Amino acid sequence: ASMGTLAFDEYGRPFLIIKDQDRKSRLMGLEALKSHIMAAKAVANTMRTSLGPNGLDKMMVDKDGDVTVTNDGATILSMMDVDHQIAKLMVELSKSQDDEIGDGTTGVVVLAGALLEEAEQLLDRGIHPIRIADGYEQAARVAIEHLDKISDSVLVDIKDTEPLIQTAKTTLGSKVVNSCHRQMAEIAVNAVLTVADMERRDVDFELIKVEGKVGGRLEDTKLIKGVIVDKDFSHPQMPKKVEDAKIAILTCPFEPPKPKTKHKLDVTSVEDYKALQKYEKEKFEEMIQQIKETGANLAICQWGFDDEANHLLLQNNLPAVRWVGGPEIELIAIATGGRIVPRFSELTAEKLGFAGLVQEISFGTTKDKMLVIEQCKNSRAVTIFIRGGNKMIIEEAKRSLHDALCVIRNLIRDNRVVYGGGAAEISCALAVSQEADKCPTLEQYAMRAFADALEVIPMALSENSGMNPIQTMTEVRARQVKEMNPALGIDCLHKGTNDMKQQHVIETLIGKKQQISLATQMVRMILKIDDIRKP
Amino acid sequence: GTDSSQGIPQLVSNISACQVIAEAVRTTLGPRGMDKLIVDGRGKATISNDGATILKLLDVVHPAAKTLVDIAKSQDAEVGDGTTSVTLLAAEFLKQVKPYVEEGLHPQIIIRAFRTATQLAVNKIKEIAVTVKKADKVEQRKLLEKCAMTALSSKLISQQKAFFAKMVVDAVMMLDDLLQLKMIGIKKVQGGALEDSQLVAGVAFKKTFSYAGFEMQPKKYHNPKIALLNVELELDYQAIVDAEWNILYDKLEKIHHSGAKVVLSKLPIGDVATQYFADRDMFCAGRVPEEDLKRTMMACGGSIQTSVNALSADVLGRCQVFEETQIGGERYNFFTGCPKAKTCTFILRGGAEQFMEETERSLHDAIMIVRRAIKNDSVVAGGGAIEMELSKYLRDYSRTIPGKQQLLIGAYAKALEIIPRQLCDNAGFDATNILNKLRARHAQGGTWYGVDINNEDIADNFEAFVWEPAMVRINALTAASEAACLIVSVDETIKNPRS
Amino acid sequence: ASLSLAPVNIFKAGADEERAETARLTSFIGAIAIGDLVKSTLGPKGMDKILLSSGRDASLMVTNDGATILKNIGVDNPAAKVLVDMSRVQDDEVGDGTTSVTVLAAELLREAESLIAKKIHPQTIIAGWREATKAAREALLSSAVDHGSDEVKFRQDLMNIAGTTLSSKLLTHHKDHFTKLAVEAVLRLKGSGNLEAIHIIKKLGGSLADSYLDEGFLLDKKIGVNQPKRIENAKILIANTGMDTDKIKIFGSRVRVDSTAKVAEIEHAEKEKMKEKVERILKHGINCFINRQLIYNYPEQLFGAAGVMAIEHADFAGVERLALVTGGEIASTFDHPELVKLGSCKLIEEVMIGEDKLIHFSGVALGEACTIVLRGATQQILDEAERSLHDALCVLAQTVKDSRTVYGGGCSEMLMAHAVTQLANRTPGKEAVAMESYAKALRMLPTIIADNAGYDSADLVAQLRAAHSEGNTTAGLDMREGTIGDMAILGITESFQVKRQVLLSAAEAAEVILRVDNIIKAAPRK
Ligand SMILES: Nc1ncnc2c1ncn2[C@@H]1O[C@H](COP(=O)(O)OP(=O)(O)O)[C@@H](O)[C@H]1O
Ligand SMILES: Nc1ncnc2c1ncn2[C@@H]1O[C@H](COP(=O)(O)OP(=O)(O)O)[C@@H](O)[C@H]1O
Ligand SMILES: Nc1ncnc2c1ncn2[C@@H]1O[C@H](COP(=O)(O)OP(=O)(O)O)[C@@H](O)[C@H]1O
């Protein structure tokens, strides 16, 4: 056990082979697989409690000390201190699931953990992982055909909101935001339907940025159709309200250009200094006249400008802002149709933007103000500006909106949906049990193993609140054998019936299909690892 | 703080390092062999069931380990994939000669005995090798199709596997020019049934945001050829901006005058200017992959342009036809229709996103298995059958040699037994009983019984159509013996640092 | 399958994450610590608190308001950080009630861990707390009153509200004078929320009763040497011009001469350009000049020869507020005398208070600013005075924006107590128990309110309960006698919006905290 083999020689003379094996570790096969699946316990049983409507939130802190409370499983596991390689592999499993689905992050992790745990007490009986992998693939195809048995479709029209509202509400019920449930359902619907493409294509996330700052109330949440910038006007004395603002995009400082080549200029007489002064003054006046040429009602800079230019702009009654970042300028231009003006000579009449309404909002005694444009006729950007108790409730609202947008996107890119809430997984358990009954014993072991592992979803759903697991199972499959419906599951909030159709518990079929598939394949390929050689 | 560099201690250290190297890659041998994710330290984990790739990504500092790895790489580049087999065989030689060098057997006696045993085995293998090339291989290809079966046996893809084997075998007859790894490639397609995979005499490359210019190309064009341009085409004020406009205008005029159906530019071609750049009146693209190029100069000879208004005869040269159709809802970009399209690509049509690894392990083996079957004539039963036969020959001949070579040849014969052992290990079965049955049957009953991966029992692998080139096995065994001889021939290590 | 007893674990050097129940323990003990550090400053008998940084710097704060107390404190519990965040949000919204909402949240978490010990699940707690918050909001809406339409009634309500707000501060002795001053300043702002338009001086010496809201201003700058020491009815000019070590922004030019005559001619050129710049300054018709940057000897000598006052080192905020209140303008190009705006002033002089010289300003044109002289004995009593004045101004401005008011001082508190009590009595289940613990914490807030003076708790709770039973939504405690009274008559009035925001924020923060189960810690950096 400890220190490997304790001989130090074959006859008795001084000898050594392994460098400091006393403080090293050697693993060969089963012990390595136990280490991996014990990591699987760590990740899965940490993740499990955020499942279902009674899913609580988590506090996770890195070595930096970032305060983070979330409810979307991928978000919990995103920045947690991952140490073991297979745990990290599960982390990008969840990341990929979120990227190509956006919902069901909790399901994949818990399912994989259950599969791997049941596989380890399978191995404890002395069975080689290839058989378990084959049995799990058979379970995967059985589950896939069972899902295909009771599939259903929805509408993919832009105007359709009521089933969309129901699905978003079901998705967001498990979060803290369920106080304003229907309100934010409508808000998410408006945000997604403001800009949308029906040509089976995606919506760029670089075009849409959603942010919010502290203060206000949760009910104050609304949809802002415009560009928001956390910047104020260059001169405070200038009146903050500007209408018909012709956005003049500028991305150059109001300073003379200078080449990077190593050059030296020598000044020897009064005439040279006076000529340089006159040239600087005339060029500044030229810049001011060029700005005044178009008569724009809004000029946006990049790197700011000095006090002389500030007074020149103020004296001309020309609205302007300074210290605006490059990405912000690009977003403003693409939303307002403006062009790029990297220098003074490129300031033309065809390279300016326009905003329908520019407004500044102050919440009172905060000493910091904000400027947001909105009502853009051809806006290329949308956003939600939420108000709440403090920063982390706002961040949770951001993540809830992200999940709602994800589920709406899933409903749009494919109409196929099913009902869950413990119904689909229990039906899958019944199916896998049936094929196990009609399975040869050697792989019937793995069949029933996979069934037992996949029955972990109602386990976590019940233990997040408290109802019994097993009588719940009994009542559910009794009703399912009495009549088949993809919505015979768990009554989490005591609605009276186990019928998700009445309670409008809706989730996309594609999400849970990929849940099962990804869980199966990654569980298999983890079963294809049995070696660790930590030095 | 232990120092050991004397002759015998250095020999045992070197061969123990070789033992560790073998122990690292013990379990990856065979078709059902398992693997390990190895991270390069940059966050990029690597999975590759091929042992040769594992050693390529592996890095070890021991000089003996370095020599063994170099010999493995040399074997890899010559024929087939026997790196795991030869490394395991050499390491077995070393670990079974441990108890012989540990008490005073001089290395030269061992070298001589190993050479003698290698000659004995390479001569006794030729009396058992059976040639099958004349047994209806070039025509009436049922036997070669069964050889293709053996690479993908015992799987539910069998219905698709038969069609895929006929696919690859017909590709072999119409590309029977000693096919290699790079002459044939595969491309991934998402969605569709597994049966929908079909062979195209060309390549497939989906167009992306920085790949192609615009849609509705003239697919049915009589002579479309690839044209490669090393000049930008995508989109003080009156000094460089007007220069940019003039450059754009003259490049557009060059594109119009050239008339090349397919045009490639070195800078990426953005799709945001699809309406801006739809006026070219012929297909234009950019950011061509190097693999796509390498699959097109030998196809029908795509040209390269290297001037402001460079025009060549092969911008619109003679290639049969261009293919550009919607594959899975997104239009691809096929550089097909070539007189010398010596590159057949298997369209990976399947509904599984993570099926690429299974396709690589399941489609690359069929072409290799049929190519090795065609290239050589004499074959012997695989699955450790030939190894067991050689072990029996060497064990029964060692007792006939009077001299110190007896124990050395006996250890050599004992070390030729790991191939069935490793195969049944990777299969997961208990090695003792299967090896016992295989050895007893091979020594007494038959001369070709080998391991079975499907039913996990001893069977005559000759009847199971488990073939392997006799010459490939001969040279692999010779290389393993040479590696063992070289690593035994070590006495002292000299480093003499410059610092 | 947990880490309570496991042969193997996954941790980094020094890393040891901790389970859900002990996570609740640690987070809630941190919340209790935050509440204890912010409590004891409630009610008219609030007690000041000192700050002393653990390092050698030892940052020392003296203030009666808990928001500043929690601003400067080391944080280790993330729930404590949540509490600090919500308190800061309340402070950014309104001035008063931040300590109220903080202590409400702290006691709510106390009762939450008590309920956890009472073997109940957090989700039922959150549901019950949401229902109870709804009921309490309804009850508060029942007795809401607004009197912003009538100007005289609005002024009376402002008087009462500012008096109640300043009672909890140290200025309770001169509460009446301070309230009159606050009303005058707020009505001089014409209802504007521009806090930067209000400045209060921190000068040492004198008695706090001598404080007054002077209509003019005070300048802390110094008079030049040759410049006149008294200029009356001048014109206010504000400039951004550097006019110190003046050089062209082009750094690519250097002096490479072969004779010192060239250097002397160059220096003559800069002195001539200085003379031209001074002439450009003087041609605008100015007598008082305000500058952000320093002034050299030649410009001040020329100004003294020209008889024009010069003011230097006046920051952007001060000059901007001066332009807002007077009529001046900030400038950088002096070739446009007609395009530069100047203010109108009446009285500029010097005043000697104690042993320090101050340039006194008076006779404003617009009057859209508030400056108050404070005769604080020490620096810290001063800081308390400005903090209390700022809180009073903020609450007056908020009442101006929203004139709905209620009667607090424990009266409204017992109103919510009664509402949640009936709600609990009219429903079964652990939800009712959870919201009864809610209401018990609500009632425990006046426990601290009254025990800052050492008064009876249970007797007054029962008395107010009976009074609200007869329907007296105006019966609250009086610190003078410890009995009931009419808060309308007694003048203890509170803004409806501020109180509703406090209640809602406390409920929301409690709900947020109760939804976290497990806290995991990475490897500590120390
Ligand atoms: N109201 C509800 N009733 C029953 N089950 C629910 C309800 N809301 C959510 N669920 C279940 O919770 C599971 C996971 O939801 P959640 O963890 O909140 O987000 P995600 O789906 O991204 O993991 C879903 O599979 C769904 O079946
Ligand atoms: N279907 C099969 N059943 C049994 N053995 C097989 C089968 N297919 C291949 N093998 C064995 O695999 C060996 C070849 O493996 P090899 O290519 O050396 O692995 P690697 O590429 O990792 O070096 C052969 O000796 C053969 O006996
Ligand atoms: N005369 C009074 N009688 C009863 N309660 C009062 C009286 N004056 C103030 N209070 C209460 O004491 C609390 C403390 O106020 P203060 O310390 O000024 O700000 P904060 O409310 O942020 O602590 C206030 O919420 C107020 O309701």
Coordinates of N, CA, C and O in Angstrom, one line a residue, chain B residues 341-389:
Chain B
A341 N -8.6 13.4 -59.7 CA -9.1 13.5 -58.3 C -8.8 12.3 -57.6 O -9.6 11.4 -57.3
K342 N -7.5 12.1 -57.2 CA -7.0 11.0 -56.4 C -7.2 11.2 -55.0 O -6.3 11.1 -54.2
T343 N -8.4 11.6 -54.6 CA -8.7 11.9 -53.2 C -10.2 11.7 -53.0 O -11.0 12.5 -53.4
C344 N -10.6 10.5 -52.4 CA -12.0 10.2 -52.1 C -12.3 10.4 -50.7 O -11.6 9.9 -49.8
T345 N -13.3 11.2 -50.4 CA -13.7 11.7 -49.1 C -15.0 11.0 -48.7 O -16.0 11.1 -49.4
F346 N -15.0 10.4 -47.5 CA -16.2 9.7 -47.0 C -17.0 10.8 -46.2 O -16.5 11.3 -45.2
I347 N -18.1 11.1 -46.7 CA -19.0 12.1 -46.1 C -19.5 11.6 -44.8 O -20.3 10.6 -44.8
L348 N -19.1 12.1 -43.7 CA -19.5 11.7 -42.3 C -20.9 12.1 -42.1 O -21.1 13.1 -41.5
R349 N -21.9 11.3 -42.6 CA -23.3 11.7 -42.4 C -23.8 10.9 -41.2 O -24.1 9.6 -41.3
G350 N -24.1 11.5 -40.1 CA -24.6 10.9 -38.9 C -25.2 11.9 -38.0 O -24.9 13.1 -38.0
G351 N -26.1 11.4 -37.1 CA -26.8 12.3 -36.2 C -26.1 12.5 -34.9 O -26.7 13.1 -34.0
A352 N -24.9 12.0 -34.7 CA -24.2 12.1 -33.4 C -23.1 13.1 -33.6 O -22.2 13.1 -34.5
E353 N -23.1 14.1 -32.7 CA -22.1 15.2 -32.7 C -20.7 14.7 -32.4 O -19.7 15.1 -33.0
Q354 N -20.6 13.8 -31.4 CA -19.3 13.3 -30.9 C -19.0 12.0 -31.6 O -18.3 11.1 -30.9
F355 N -19.4 11.8 -32.8 CA -19.1 10.5 -33.6 C -17.8 10.6 -34.4 O -17.5 9.7 -35.1
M356 N -17.1 11.7 -34.3 CA -15.9 11.9 -35.1 C -14.8 10.9 -34.7 O -14.1 10.3 -35.5
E357 N -14.6 10.7 -33.3 CA -13.6 9.7 -32.9 C -13.9 8.3 -33.3 O -13.1 7.6 -33.7
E358 N -15.2 7.9 -33.2 CA -15.6 6.6 -33.6 C -15.5 6.4 -35.1 O -15.1 5.3 -35.6
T359 N -15.7 7.5 -35.9 CA -15.5 7.4 -37.3 C -14.1 7.2 -37.7 O -13.7 6.5 -38.5
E360 N -13.2 8.0 -37.0 CA -11.8 7.9 -37.2 C -11.2 6.5 -36.9 O -10.4 5.9 -37.6
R361 N -11.7 5.9 -35.7 CA -11.3 4.6 -35.4 C -12.0 3.5 -36.2 O -11.5 2.4 -36.2
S362 N -13.1 3.8 -36.9 CA -13.9 2.8 -37.6 C -13.8 2.9 -39.1 O -14.1 2.0 -39.8
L363 N -13.4 4.1 -39.6 CA -13.2 4.2 -41.1 C -11.8 4.2 -41.5 O -11.5 3.8 -42.7
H364 N -10.9 4.7 -40.7 CA -9.5 4.7 -41.1 C -8.9 3.3 -41.0 O -7.9 3.0 -41.7
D365 N -9.4 2.4 -40.2 CA -8.9 1.1 -40.1 C -9.3 0.2 -41.3 O -8.5 -0.6 -41.7
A366 N -10.4 0.4 -41.9 CA -10.9 -0.4 -43.0 C -10.0 -0.2 -44.2 O -9.5 -1.2 -44.8
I367 N -9.7 1.1 -44.6 CA -8.8 1.3 -45.7 C -7.4 0.8 -45.4 O -6.8 0.1 -46.3
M368 N -6.9 0.9 -44.2 CA -5.6 0.4 -43.9 C -5.6 -1.1 -43.9 O -4.6 -1.8 -44.4
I369 N -6.7 -1.8 -43.4 CA -6.7 -3.2 -43.3 C -6.7 -3.8 -44.7 O -6.0 -4.7 -45.0
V370 N -7.5 -3.2 -45.6 CA -7.6 -3.7 -47.0 C -6.3 -3.4 -47.7 O -5.9 -4.2 -48.5
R371 N -5.7 -2.3 -47.5 CA -4.5 -1.9 -48.1 C -3.3 -2.9 -47.7 O -2.6 -3.3 -48.6
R372 N -3.2 -3.2 -46.4 CA -2.2 -4.1 -46.0 C -2.5 -5.5 -46.5 O -1.6 -6.3 -46.8
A373 N -3.8 -5.9 -46.6 CA -4.1 -7.2 -47.2 C -3.7 -7.3 -48.6 O -3.2 -8.4 -49.1
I374 N -3.9 -6.3 -49.4 CA -3.6 -6.3 -50.8 C -2.1 -6.2 -51.0 O -1.5 -7.0 -51.8
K375 N -1.4 -5.4 -50.3 CA 0.0 -5.1 -50.5 C 0.9 -6.4 -50.3 O 1.8 -6.7 -51.2
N376 N 0.6 -7.2 -49.3 CA 1.3 -8.4 -49.0 C 0.5 -9.6 -49.4 O -0.8 -9.5 -49.6
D377 N 1.1 -10.7 -49.6 CA 0.5 -12.0 -50.0 C 0.4 -13.0 -48.9 O -0.7 -13.5 -48.6
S378 N 1.5 -13.4 -48.3 CA 1.5 -14.3 -47.2 C 1.0 -13.7 -45.9 O 1.4 -12.6 -45.6
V379 N 0.1 -14.4 -45.3 CA -0.5 -13.9 -44.1 C -0.6 -15.1 -43.1 O -0.6 -16.3 -43.5
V380 N -0.7 -14.8 -41.8 CA -0.8 -15.8 -40.7 C -1.9 -15.3 -39.8 O -2.3 -14.1 -39.8
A381 N -2.5 -16.3 -39.1 CA -3.6 -16.0 -38.2 C -3.1 -15.0 -37.1 O -2.1 -15.2 -36.5
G382 N -3.9 -14.0 -36.9 CA -3.6 -12.9 -36.0 C -4.2 -13.2 -34.6 O -4.4 -14.4 -34.2
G383 N -4.3 -12.2 -33.8 CA -4.8 -12.3 -32.4 C -3.9 -13.2 -31.5 O -4.4 -13.9 -30.7
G384 N -2.6 -13.0 -31.7 CA -1.7 -13.8 -30.9 C -1.4 -15.2 -31.3 O -0.6 -15.9 -30.7
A385 N -2.1 -15.7 -32.4 CA -1.8 -17.0 -32.9 C -0.4 -17.2 -33.4 O 0.3 -18.2 -33.0
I386 N 0.1 -16.3 -34.2 CA 1.4 -16.4 -34.7 C 2.4 -16.2 -33.6 O 3.5 -16.9 -33.5
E387 N 2.1 -15.3 -32.6 CA 3.0 -15.2 -31.4 C 3.1 -16.5 -30.6 O 4.2 -16.9 -30.2
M388 N 2.0 -17.1 -30.4 CA 2.0 -18.4 -29.7 C 2.8 -19.5 -30.5 O 3.5 -20.3 -29.9
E389 N 2.6 -19.5 -31.8 CA 3.3 -20.5 -32.6 C 4.8 -20.2 -32.5 O 5.6 -21.2 -32.4

